C-alpha cells in the first residue's frame, strides 16, 4: 500500500522475478493472491574494518635545531628517533660572521612535532557484511521487515500466508577492488589502488595510538632558498582538494559510524504459500461515505478512502467499475478483495480504471456511490 505516492513504481505480474533498487517500489499482482508492495529501506554494511587512516589537515609545533661548523660532521637531535616529528638535515653558509672559524657549508638539522588536525578513514567492506532490509507490506488499505544477507527466507505475513523470497545480491560492485572512504561526515566508494596511491600522510588501519604518521613529508615541505635558513611549512587542509578528487565517486549516506548504501537487487519469490484474507465473508449491505475523494496517481490508477456505516461489520465491499447503465465491468482492482475490518475504521481502495469515462461503485443500491472518472489517453 506504501508505493501509492512514489513515482518510481513498478508493476509485476506473478504466477516470479523482481528488481529492488533504492527509492524504487515494486507492486506484485497474481490471480486469487493478495497484492504485495516491496521496498529496500537500508543497504547498510554491519562492522567495517579500517584499512588506512589519511591525514588531510596537519600542524607543526615544538621546533628544535642543532648546527655544526664546516668540516665538523652532521648534527644530531634526540627528536630524530621520535617518529612524532618531521626531521630534516640541510646545509647553510657559515663563517666568522656566524661564529665559525672556517668558511663553508655547515650542517643543520631541524625537527618539528607533526600533529593531525583532521583525518579520514577508508574502510574494508566484504559482500558478506552487507545487510539488506526489504519491507513487504500487503496492499489491504488498512507489514514484515525482512533482513537478507548473501548467505532464502520465508516471509510470513500475518493473515495472508508466506512469501518465498530468494535474492541475487549482485548490485554490480566488486568489494575487493573497492574501498569505503569515510571523511568526517560524508563517505564514498572508490577503487583500491587509487586510495592506496594518495599522496597524504597515513597510519595503518590497525593503529590506535594515532601519532607515528608515515609520509609526513607530503604535507610538509622544507625550503632553504638562500643557504641562510631552513624553513618548515604545512600544505594546509586537503579537505576541499579531496572533495574535488571524489566527484564521480559513489556517495554513502552513513549515519553515526554505521554505513548505509544506495542498493540494487534481482530478487525472485514464490506466491504458492500466499492466500487471500476474508474469503469466508459476506457483502456490505449498508452505505459508505467518501473519507477521501478519488485521486489519480502518478500512474494511471485511482485511490479512494471510504468508511462503512452499516451493521455488516466484517464484510466484503461491493466495488465495481462500470458505465452509466451499470451494464458491464471495465477495469480491475489494485487493492484486491477489499474488506471492512471495523465500520469505524476507513478503507483505501486502489483500482485501475479503463481509458476514458467510467463509473466507480462503492456499496449496494440504498446509499450506493456513483463516481465518474475520465482516464487520459
Amino acid at each position, epitope marked *: 500500500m506504501r508505493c501509492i505516492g512514489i513515482s518510481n513504481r513498478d508493476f509485476v505480474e506473478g504466477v516470479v522475478d523482481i528488481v529492488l533498487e533504492h527509492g524504487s517500489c515494486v507492486t506484485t499482482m497474481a490471480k486469487n493472491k493478495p497484492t504485495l508492495d516491496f521496498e529496500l529501506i537500508k543497504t547498510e554494511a554491519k562492522q567495517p574494518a579500517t584499512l588506512r587512516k589519511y591525514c588531510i589537515e596537519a600542524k607543526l609545533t615544538n621546533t*628544535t635545531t642543532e*648546527s*655544526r*661548523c664546516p668540516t665538523q660532521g652532521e*648534527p644530531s637531535l634526540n627528536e630524530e628517533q621520535d617518529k612524532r616529528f618531521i626531521c630534516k638535515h640541510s646545509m647553510v653558509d657559515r663563517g666568522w*660572521g*656566524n*661564529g665559525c672559524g672556517l668558511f663553508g657549508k655547515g650542517g643543520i638539522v631541524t625537527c618539528a612535532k607533526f600533529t593531525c588536525k583532521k583525518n579520514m578513514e577508508g574502510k574494508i567492506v566484504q559482500p558478506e557484511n552487507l545487510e539488506y532490509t526489504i519491507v513487504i507490506t500487503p496492499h489491504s488499505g488498512e507489514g514484515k521487515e525482512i533482513k537478507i544477507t548473501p548467505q532464502t527466507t520465508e516471509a510470513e505475513l500475518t493473515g495472508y500466508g508466506t512469501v518465498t523470497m530468494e535474492c541475487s545480491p549482485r548490485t554490480g560492485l566488486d568489494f575487493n577492488e573497492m574501498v569505503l572512504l569515510q571523511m568526517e561526515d560524508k563517505a564514498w566508494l572508490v577503487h583500491r589502488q587509487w586510495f592506496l596511491d594518495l599522496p597524504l600522510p597515513w597510519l595503518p588501519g590497525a593503529d590506535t595510538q594515532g601519532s607515528n604518521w608515515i609520509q609526513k613529508e607530503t604535507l610538509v615541505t622544507f625550503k632553504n632558498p638562500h643557504a*641562510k635558513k631552513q624553513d618548515v611549512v604545512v600544505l594546509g587542509s586537503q579537505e576541499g582538494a579531496m572533495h574535488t578528487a571524489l566527484t564521480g565517486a559513489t556517495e554513502i549516506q552513513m549515519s553515526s559510524g554505521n554505513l548505509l548504501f544506495t542498493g540494487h537487487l534481482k530478487c525472485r519469490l514464490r506466491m504458492d504459500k500466499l492466500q487471500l484474507k476474508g474469503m469466508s465473508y459476506s457483502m456490505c449491505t449498508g452505505k459508505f461515505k467518501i473519507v477521501k475523494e478519488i485521486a489519480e496517481t502518478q500512474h494511471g490508477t485511482i485511490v479512494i478512502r471510504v468508511q462503512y456505516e452499516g451493521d455488516g461489520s466484517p464484510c466484503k465491499i461491493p466495488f465495481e467499475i462500470t458505465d452509466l447503465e451499470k451494464r458491464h465491468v471495465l477495469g480491475r482492482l489494485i487493492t484486491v478483495n477489499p474488506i471492512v475490518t471495523e465500520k469505524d475504521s476507513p478503507v483505501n481502495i486502489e483500482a485501475e480504471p479503463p481509458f476514458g469515462d467510467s463509473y466507480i461503485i462503492v456499496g449496494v443500491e440504498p446509499g450506493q456511490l456513483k463516481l465518474n472518472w475520465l482516464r487520459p489517453l
Partner: antibody
Amino acid sequence: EVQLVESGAEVKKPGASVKVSCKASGYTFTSYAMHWVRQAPGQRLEWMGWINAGNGNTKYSQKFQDRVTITRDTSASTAYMELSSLRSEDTAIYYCARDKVDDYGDYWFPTLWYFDYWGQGTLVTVS
Amino acid sequence: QSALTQPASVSGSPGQSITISCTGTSSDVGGFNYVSWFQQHPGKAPKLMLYDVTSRPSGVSSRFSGSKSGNTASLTISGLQAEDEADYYCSSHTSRGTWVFGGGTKLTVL
C-alpha cells in the same frame, strides 16, 4: 642613547606569578631580540630565553620551558617575562639584555656581541 | 650545576698581568667562536668586555685580551689597574642554539 629599563623590585609569596617589564629606548626595538637572564644571590648567571621583537617568535631554556612565558609590546617598546609557580629557588635579580636580529628579521644565529646592552635588574624576593 | 668551568677567584699585584680560564665542550667553546666575557662590579649590571674570543667593544680598555685552545677560552688582563676588582663571567652560544654561562671569578686587586 641605548637604555634598557626593567620594572622595580617586587616581593611575592611562594606559588604566585611574577611579571617583569623591560622598556627599550634609544634604538629600534623591533629589529632586536630581548633575552632574559636570572642572577641568583651570589651565584652564576642563568639564561632563561629570548623573544624576537619583530615577528614575536620565542625560544625558552629547558629549565624554564613550562614556567616562563615571554611577551612583547611593539607599540610601547616593552618586553615582558612572566614566571609562574614561583619557589624559594626563584629568589633572584632578573636581567633583560638585547642582541641584534638578522636584516631579514630571522634569528637563527645571534650577533657576535650578544649581550652588548643590559637592564639595571629586578630583585624578585620569595617569602 | 654550572655549564662552564671557571675558577672561583683570582688575585694579582697592581700593574701585573693575570689570566682567567673558561672550560667548555665541543658543542659550545670547542665548536664555535661565540665566546664572550662580562665584567660585573658589585651592585651593577654585567658589561660585555670581550666578544668573538679576541674582539672588544668601543668603550673597553685594550689591556683585556682573549684566547681559545680546543674547548678552553682565556681572559688575559695585562697591567692590573685600580677599578678591576669585579666578578668576571664567560659565556657561549651552544650548537643547540642556547646560551651557557660560567661559574664566575672574583678578581682581587690587593
